[PDB]
PDB file of C-alpha atoms and ligand atoms in Angstrom:
ATOM      1  CA  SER A   1     -23.765  -7.907  15.075  1.00 47.71           C
ATOM      2  CA  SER A   2     -24.432  -5.878  18.234  1.00 50.00           C
ATOM      3  CA  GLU A   3     -25.022  -7.457  21.612  1.00 50.91           C
ATOM      4  CA  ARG A   4     -28.306  -5.599  21.815  1.00 53.60           C
ATOM      5  CA  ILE A   5     -29.803  -7.480  18.868  1.00 53.26           C
ATOM      6  CA  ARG A   6     -28.141 -10.796  19.753  1.00 53.33           C
ATOM      7  CA  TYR A   7     -29.720 -10.840  23.207  1.00 53.05           C
ATOM      8  CA  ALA A   8     -33.050  -9.474  22.015  1.00 52.77           C
ATOM      9  CA  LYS A   9     -33.170 -12.344  19.524  1.00 53.07           C
ATOM     10  CA  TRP A  10     -32.043 -14.694  22.332  1.00 54.84           C
ATOM     11  CA  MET A  11     -34.997 -13.799  24.535  1.00 56.58           C
ATOM     12  CA  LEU A  12     -37.399 -14.296  21.634  1.00 53.42           C
ATOM     13  CA  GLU A  13     -35.694 -17.572  20.780  1.00 54.92           C
ATOM     14  CA  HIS A  14     -36.698 -18.756  24.233  1.00 55.38           C
ATOM     15  CA  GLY A  15     -40.362 -17.829  23.961  1.00 53.95           C
ATOM     16  CA  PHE A  16     -40.290 -14.531  25.846  1.00 55.06           C
ATOM     17  CA  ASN A  17     -41.794 -11.323  24.534  1.00 57.45           C
ATOM     18  CA  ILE A  18     -39.826  -8.106  24.260  1.00 57.19           C
ATOM     19  CA  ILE A  19     -40.899  -4.579  23.398  1.00 58.23           C
ATOM     20  CA  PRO A  20     -38.817  -1.798  21.855  1.00 57.46           C
ATOM     21  CA  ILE A  21     -38.324   1.382  23.906  1.00 53.92           C
ATOM     22  CA  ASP A  22     -38.872   4.813  22.297  1.00 55.52           C
ATOM     23  CA  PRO A  23     -35.533   6.668  22.383  1.00 50.93           C
ATOM     24  CA  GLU A  24     -37.185   9.929  23.391  1.00 49.92           C
ATOM     25  CA  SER A  25     -40.088   9.032  25.671  1.00 51.59           C
ATOM     26  CA  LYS A  26     -37.885   6.298  27.115  1.00 49.29           C
ATOM     27  CA  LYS A  27     -41.045   4.195  27.402  1.00 44.00           C
ATOM     28  CA  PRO A  28     -42.327   1.175  25.452  1.00 46.05           C
ATOM     29  CA  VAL A  29     -43.294   1.991  21.865  1.00 44.48           C
ATOM     30  CA  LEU A  30     -46.827   0.807  22.671  1.00 45.06           C
ATOM     31  CA  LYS A  31     -48.884   2.211  25.547  1.00 48.24           C
ATOM     32  CA  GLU A  32     -50.541  -1.123  26.240  1.00 47.59           C
ATOM     33  CA  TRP A  33     -47.397  -3.230  26.377  1.00 45.68           C
ATOM     34  CA  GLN A  34     -48.768  -5.038  29.446  1.00 47.59           C
ATOM     35  CA  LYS A  35     -50.801  -7.318  27.171  1.00 46.45           C
ATOM     36  CA  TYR A  36     -47.486  -8.933  26.258  1.00 44.74           C
ATOM     37  CA  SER A  37     -47.249 -10.561  29.668  1.00 44.50           C
ATOM     38  CA  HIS A  38     -49.923 -12.854  28.260  1.00 42.62           C
ATOM     39  CA  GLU A  39     -49.656 -13.073  24.467  1.00 41.51           C
ATOM     40  CA  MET A  40     -47.231 -12.695  21.588  1.00 45.42           C
ATOM     41  CA  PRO A  41     -47.146 -10.190  19.297  1.00 46.45           C
ATOM     42  CA  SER A  42     -48.002 -11.108  15.691  1.00 44.58           C
ATOM     43  CA  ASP A  43     -45.338 -12.001  13.119  1.00 43.97           C
ATOM     44  CA  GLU A  44     -45.812  -8.569  11.504  1.00 41.81           C
ATOM     45  CA  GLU A  45     -45.305  -6.852  15.053  1.00 42.97           C
ATOM     46  CA  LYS A  46     -42.267  -8.967  15.955  1.00 44.96           C
ATOM     47  CA  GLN A  47     -40.490  -8.054  12.713  1.00 44.40           C
ATOM     48  CA  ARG A  48     -41.286  -4.392  13.285  1.00 43.43           C
ATOM     49  CA  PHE A  49     -39.928  -4.592  16.823  1.00 40.72           C
ATOM     50  CA  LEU A  50     -36.686  -6.270  15.711  1.00 40.70           C
ATOM     51  CA  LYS A  51     -36.024  -3.649  13.023  1.00 44.62           C
ATOM     52  CA  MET A  52     -36.355  -0.844  15.589  1.00 46.01           C
ATOM     53  CA  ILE A  53     -33.952  -2.642  17.921  1.00 45.55           C
ATOM     54  CA  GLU A  54     -31.513  -3.271  15.077  1.00 47.47           C
ATOM     55  CA  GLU A  55     -31.859   0.393  14.182  1.00 49.08           C
ATOM     56  CA  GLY A  56     -30.720   1.104  17.742  1.00 47.24           C
ATOM     57  CA  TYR A  57     -33.768   1.123  20.017  1.00 47.41           C
ATOM     58  CA  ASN A  58     -33.329  -0.354  23.504  1.00 51.77           C
ATOM     59  CA  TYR A  59     -35.861  -3.018  24.428  1.00 52.71           C
ATOM     60  CA  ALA A  60     -37.690  -4.246  27.476  1.00 55.53           C
ATOM     61  CA  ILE A  61     -38.893  -7.530  28.820  1.00 54.38           C
ATOM     62  CA  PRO A  62     -42.350  -7.538  30.418  1.00 54.00           C
ATOM     63  CA  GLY A  63     -42.380  -9.394  33.724  1.00 51.02           C
ATOM     64  CA  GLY A  64     -44.903 -12.045  34.704  1.00 47.60           C
ATOM     65  CA  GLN A  65     -44.613 -13.928  31.393  1.00 43.07           C
ATOM     66  CA  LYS A  66     -44.783 -17.676  31.868  1.00 41.13           C
ATOM     67  CA  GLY A  67     -44.237 -17.146  35.577  1.00 41.37           C
ATOM     68  CA  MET A  68     -41.057 -15.217  34.831  1.00 41.20           C
ATOM     69  CA  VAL A  69     -40.177 -12.479  37.363  1.00 39.97           C
ATOM     70  CA  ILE A  70     -37.088 -10.334  37.843  1.00 39.55           C
ATOM     71  CA  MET A  71     -35.529  -9.764  41.250  1.00 37.87           C
ATOM     72  CA  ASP A  72     -34.219  -6.212  40.884  1.00 37.43           C
ATOM     73  CA  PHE A  73     -31.434  -5.445  43.381  1.00 35.95           C
ATOM     74  CA  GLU A  74     -30.222  -1.873  43.694  1.00 37.02           C
ATOM     75  CA  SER A  75     -26.623  -2.915  44.357  1.00 38.84           C
ATOM     76  CA  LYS A  76     -24.657  -5.952  43.186  1.00 39.52           C
ATOM     77  CA  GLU A  77     -21.842  -5.313  45.691  1.00 38.73           C
ATOM     78  CA  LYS A  78     -24.441  -5.068  48.442  1.00 39.25           C
ATOM     79  CA  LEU A  79     -25.993  -8.383  47.458  1.00 38.64           C
ATOM     80  CA  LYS A  80     -22.551 -10.024  47.360  1.00 36.38           C
ATOM     81  CA  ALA A  81     -21.906  -8.972  50.991  1.00 35.44           C
ATOM     82  CA  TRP A  82     -25.415  -9.977  51.995  1.00 35.49           C
ATOM     83  CA  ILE A  83     -25.689 -13.558  50.716  1.00 36.55           C
ATOM     84  CA  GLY A  84     -21.999 -14.037  50.054  1.00 34.36           C
ATOM     85  CA  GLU A  85     -20.049 -14.516  46.848  1.00 33.59           C
ATOM     86  CA  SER A  86     -20.547 -18.288  46.846  1.00 34.65           C
ATOM     87  CA  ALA A  87     -24.318 -18.037  47.001  1.00 36.87           C
ATOM     88  CA  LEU A  88     -24.440 -15.289  44.384  1.00 34.93           C
ATOM     89  CA  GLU A  89     -22.308 -17.358  41.993  1.00 31.95           C
ATOM     90  CA  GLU A  90     -24.525 -20.366  42.607  1.00 31.02           C
ATOM     91  CA  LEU A  91     -27.665 -18.462  41.682  1.00 31.03           C
ATOM     92  CA  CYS A  92     -26.160 -16.802  38.609  1.00 32.14           C
ATOM     93  CA  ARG A  93     -24.988 -20.257  37.562  1.00 31.59           C
ATOM     94  CA  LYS A  94     -28.476 -21.686  37.370  1.00 31.72           C
ATOM     95  CA  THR A  95     -30.372 -18.693  36.044  1.00 32.48           C
ATOM     96  CA  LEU A  96     -29.859 -15.402  34.164  1.00 32.14           C
ATOM     97  CA  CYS A  97     -28.202 -12.470  35.979  1.00 33.31           C
ATOM     98  CA  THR A  98     -27.417  -9.101  34.449  1.00 32.86           C
ATOM     99  CA  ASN A  99     -25.747  -5.885  35.596  1.00 36.46           C
ATOM    100  CA  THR A 100     -27.950  -2.797  35.458  1.00 36.16           C
ATOM    101  CA  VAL A 101     -26.746   0.594  34.182  1.00 35.95           C
ATOM    102  CA  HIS A 102     -26.742   1.964  37.714  1.00 37.63           C
ATOM    103  CA  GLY A 103     -24.689  -0.726  39.422  1.00 37.53           C
ATOM    104  CA  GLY A 104     -27.516  -3.057  40.381  1.00 40.68           C
ATOM    105  CA  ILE A 105     -28.223  -6.623  39.391  1.00 38.83           C
ATOM    106  CA  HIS A 106     -31.217  -8.342  37.822  1.00 41.38           C
ATOM    107  CA  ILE A 107     -31.737 -12.015  38.625  1.00 43.69           C
ATOM    108  CA  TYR A 108     -34.382 -13.524  36.342  1.00 41.83           C
ATOM    109  CA  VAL A 109     -36.289 -16.561  37.646  1.00 41.41           C
ATOM    110  CA  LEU A 110     -39.318 -18.742  36.862  1.00 44.25           C
ATOM    111  CA  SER A 111     -41.717 -19.248  39.770  1.00 46.97           C
ATOM    112  CA  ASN A 112     -45.013 -21.129  39.975  1.00 42.92           C
ATOM    113  CA  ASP A 113     -45.726 -18.775  42.862  1.00 41.91           C
ATOM    114  CA  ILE A 114     -45.937 -15.218  41.547  1.00 42.49           C
ATOM    115  CA  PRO A 115     -47.144 -12.658  44.090  1.00 42.57           C
ATOM    116  CA  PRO A 116     -50.691 -12.312  42.761  1.00 43.46           C
ATOM    117  CA  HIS A 117     -50.256  -8.655  43.804  1.00 40.89           C
ATOM    118  CA  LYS A 118     -47.507  -6.035  43.722  1.00 40.89           C
ATOM    119  CA  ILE A 119     -45.372  -6.285  46.902  1.00 44.20           C
ATOM    120  CA  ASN A 120     -42.339  -3.999  47.192  1.00 42.98           C
ATOM    121  CA  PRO A 121     -39.742  -3.358  48.351  1.00 40.50           C
ATOM    122  CA  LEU A 122     -39.076  -6.969  49.378  1.00 42.28           C
ATOM    123  CA  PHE A 123     -36.195  -6.085  51.694  1.00 41.07           C
ATOM    124  CA  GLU A 124     -35.178  -2.896  53.441  1.00 45.34           C
ATOM    125  CA  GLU A 125     -31.995  -1.605  55.064  1.00 44.89           C
ATOM    126  CA  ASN A 126     -32.508   1.740  56.860  1.00 46.14           C
ATOM    127  CA  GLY A 127     -36.203   2.191  56.163  1.00 45.30           C
ATOM    128  CA  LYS A 128     -35.210   2.088  52.523  1.00 48.35           C
ATOM    129  CA  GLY A 129     -35.861  -0.728  50.096  1.00 50.15           C
ATOM    130  CA  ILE A 130     -32.962  -2.466  48.411  1.00 47.75           C
ATOM    131  CA  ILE A 131     -34.705  -4.840  46.031  1.00 48.97           C
ATOM    132  CA  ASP A 132     -37.949  -4.888  44.098  1.00 51.81           C
ATOM    133  CA  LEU A 133     -39.693  -7.779  42.387  1.00 51.85           C
ATOM    134  CA  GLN A 134     -40.674  -7.032  38.792  1.00 51.65           C
ATOM    135  CA  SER A 135     -43.675  -9.145  37.765  1.00 54.14           C
ATOM    136  CA  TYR A 136     -46.904  -8.472  35.857  1.00 53.73           C
ATOM    137  CA  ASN A 137     -47.264  -4.843  34.702  1.00 56.70           C
ATOM    138  CA  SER A 138     -43.584  -4.040  34.887  1.00 58.33           C
ATOM    139  CA  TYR A 139     -40.544  -4.561  32.727  1.00 59.04           C
ATOM    140  CA  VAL A 140     -36.760  -4.420  32.826  1.00 58.92           C
ATOM    141  CA  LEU A 141     -34.369  -3.204  30.156  1.00 61.28           C
ATOM    142  CA  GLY A 142     -32.724  -6.119  28.413  1.00 60.31           C
ATOM    143  CA  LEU A 143     -29.106  -7.061  27.776  1.00 60.77           C
ATOM    144  CA  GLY A 144     -27.415  -4.777  25.286  1.00 59.25           C
ATOM    145  CA  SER A 145     -29.599  -1.789  26.078  1.00 57.72           C
ATOM    146  CA  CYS A 146     -27.508   1.281  26.875  1.00 54.78           C
ATOM    147  CA  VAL A 147     -28.298   4.524  28.601  1.00 56.51           C
ATOM    148  CA  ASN A 148     -26.524   7.877  28.480  1.00 57.76           C
ATOM    149  CA  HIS A 149     -26.845   9.534  31.862  1.00 58.69           C
ATOM    150  CA  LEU A 150     -26.547  13.146  30.684  1.00 58.32           C
ATOM    151  CA  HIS A 151     -30.242  13.624  31.255  1.00 60.40           C
ATOM    152  CA  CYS A 152     -30.417  12.156  34.747  1.00 63.75           C
ATOM    153  CA  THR A 153     -30.645  14.790  37.445  1.00 64.76           C
ATOM    154  CA  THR A 154     -32.185  13.096  40.494  1.00 65.35           C
ATOM    155  CA  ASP A 155     -30.635  11.059  43.325  1.00 64.66           C
ATOM    156  CA  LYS A 156     -31.594   7.614  41.971  1.00 65.29           C
ATOM    157  CA  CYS A 157     -29.051   8.879  39.556  1.00 64.64           C
ATOM    158  CA  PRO A 158     -25.218   7.463  40.412  1.00 65.68           C
ATOM    159  CA  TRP A 159     -24.099   9.077  37.152  1.00 67.35           C
ATOM    160  CA  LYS A 160     -26.024  12.334  37.576  1.00 70.01           C
ATOM    161  CA  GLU A 161     -25.699  14.573  34.498  1.00 75.64           C
ATOM    162  CA  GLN A 162     -22.520  12.818  33.323  1.00 74.89           C
ATOM    163  CA  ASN A 163     -21.780  12.429  29.613  1.00 74.23           C
ATOM    164  CA  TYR A 164     -21.428   8.718  30.312  1.00 78.36           C
ATOM    165  CA  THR A 165     -23.079   5.665  28.758  1.00 78.68           C
ATOM    166  CA  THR A 166     -23.393   2.314  30.477  1.00 77.70           C
ATOM    167  CA  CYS A 167     -25.273  -0.760  29.356  1.00 77.26           C
ATOM    168  CA  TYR A 168     -27.006  -3.811  30.716  1.00 76.67           C
ATOM    169  CA  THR A 169     -24.372  -6.518  30.632  1.00 76.76           C
ATOM    170  CA  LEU A 170     -24.032 -10.129  31.708  1.00 77.05           C
ATOM    171  CA  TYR A 171     -22.986 -10.754  35.294  1.00 80.32           C
ATOM    172  CA  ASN A 172     -20.830 -13.618  33.946  1.00 75.51           C
ATOM    173  CA  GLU A 173     -22.225 -16.269  31.589  1.00 78.34           C
ATOM    174  CA  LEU A 174     -25.392 -16.323  29.526  1.00 76.27           C
ATOM    175  CA  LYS A 175     -27.914 -18.712  31.091  1.00 77.97           C
ATOM    176  CA  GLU A 176     -31.454 -19.711  30.360  1.00 74.61           C
ATOM    177  CA  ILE A 177     -33.957 -18.235  32.842  1.00 74.53           C
ATOM    178  CA  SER A 178     -34.753 -21.098  35.180  1.00 76.61           C
ATOM    179  CA  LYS A 179     -37.029 -22.177  37.986  1.00 75.21           C
ATOM    180  CA  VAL A 180     -36.393 -21.277  41.594  1.00 76.94           C
ATOM    181  CA  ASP A 181     -38.491 -21.944  44.672  1.00 75.02           C
ATOM    182  CA  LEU A 182     -39.180 -18.219  45.203  1.00 75.12           C
ATOM    183  CA  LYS A 183     -40.465 -18.329  48.760  1.00 73.29           C
ATOM    184  CA  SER A 184     -37.501 -20.506  49.701  1.00 71.83           C
ATOM    185  CA  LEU A 185     -35.126 -18.059  48.083  1.00 71.20           C
ATOM    186  CA  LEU A 186     -36.688 -15.142  49.955  1.00 69.80           C
ATOM    187  CA  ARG A 187     -36.476 -17.141  53.205  1.00 66.87           C
ATOM    188  CA  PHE A 188     -32.798 -17.592  52.470  1.00 64.90           C
ATOM    189  CA  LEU A 189     -32.209 -13.884  51.829  1.00 60.72           C
ATOM    190  CA  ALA A 190     -33.972 -13.192  55.135  1.00 59.92           C
ATOM    191  CA  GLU A 191     -31.821 -15.543  57.188  1.00 60.81           C
ATOM    192  CA  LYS A 192     -28.654 -14.141  55.602  1.00 64.50           C
ATOM    193  CA  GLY A 193     -29.770 -10.575  56.128  1.00 64.83           C
ATOM    194  CA  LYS A 194     -31.035 -10.274  59.681  1.00 63.44           C
ATOM    195  CA  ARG A 195     -27.490 -10.224  61.109  1.00 62.10           C
ATOM    196  CA  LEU A 196     -26.777  -7.345  58.710  1.00 60.07           C
ATOM    197  CA  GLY A 197     -29.873  -5.314  59.476  1.00 58.51           C
ATOM    198  CA  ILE A 198     -31.468  -6.337  56.172  1.00 55.83           C
ATOM    199  CA  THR A 199     -35.102  -7.293  56.837  1.00 56.92           C
ATOM    200  CA  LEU A 200     -38.264  -8.381  54.997  1.00 57.06           C
ATOM    201  CA  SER A 201     -40.828  -5.629  54.330  1.00 58.11           C
ATOM    202  CA  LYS A 202     -44.349  -5.653  55.775  1.00 59.35           C
ATOM    203  CA  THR A 203     -46.332  -6.814  52.748  1.00 63.08           C
ATOM    204  CA  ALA A 204     -43.394  -9.070  51.877  1.00 59.93           C
ATOM    205  CA  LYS A 205     -43.526 -11.027  55.151  1.00 61.03           C
ATOM    206  CA  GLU A 206     -47.333 -11.206  54.982  1.00 57.90           C
ATOM    207  CA  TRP A 207     -47.113 -12.943  51.585  1.00 56.94           C
ATOM    208  CA  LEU A 208     -44.145 -15.098  52.541  1.00 57.38           C
ATOM    209  CA  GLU A 209     -45.726 -16.238  55.846  1.00 58.84           C
ATOM    210  CA  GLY A 210     -48.861 -17.162  53.892  1.00 58.68           C
TER     211      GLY A 210
HETATM  212 MN1   MN B 301     -34.682  -1.166  38.982  1.00 56.61          MN
HETATM  213 ZN1   ZN B 302     -28.586   7.153  34.910  1.00 57.80          ZN
HETATM  214 ZN1   ZN B 303     -31.360 -22.186  25.069  1.00 57.18          ZN
END
């Protein structure tokens, strides 16, 4: 059928919880969706959630689940120039990467080490963050979800007020979310970025440096 339901079913298939997004509020159908970073949904909530998504609701994936966290980069092209095409391909070869509706890229990973606390932005370029880590108490829109930008009027908006719809798509190939040595990955981003003026944030270094 649609890619939206295929991928929603795919995340479930792999033991990850998803939550439908209300088309109007643009927020999860349930106020306390955070509980899904730690438990499933009953078989009479899952069914309900899948019908809504089939009907056309977008859906989100709570972070933190089974050590799963999403590295949320504001710009794919920026990341390509930062760590290089080879490194980006390598990463999106071992784990799941998706294109966001605003031109960014989500790299999903499994990490024993999850910042016990919220630490963002991880990296900054011009006193402005360029990547956030989505873990417990946050979520990302999943593959197949689409957003019409007609109602976006701020600056975080590339498609400000445009009658234009984009969707979360695969960077390249579908891959199971896999393990990565997170601190090592962040060390890598740091070494690649200092020559480009891309640096670790304050809290970020603190955590990293232990
Ligand atoms: Mn984001
Ligand atoms: Zn938009
Ligand atoms: Zn599989």
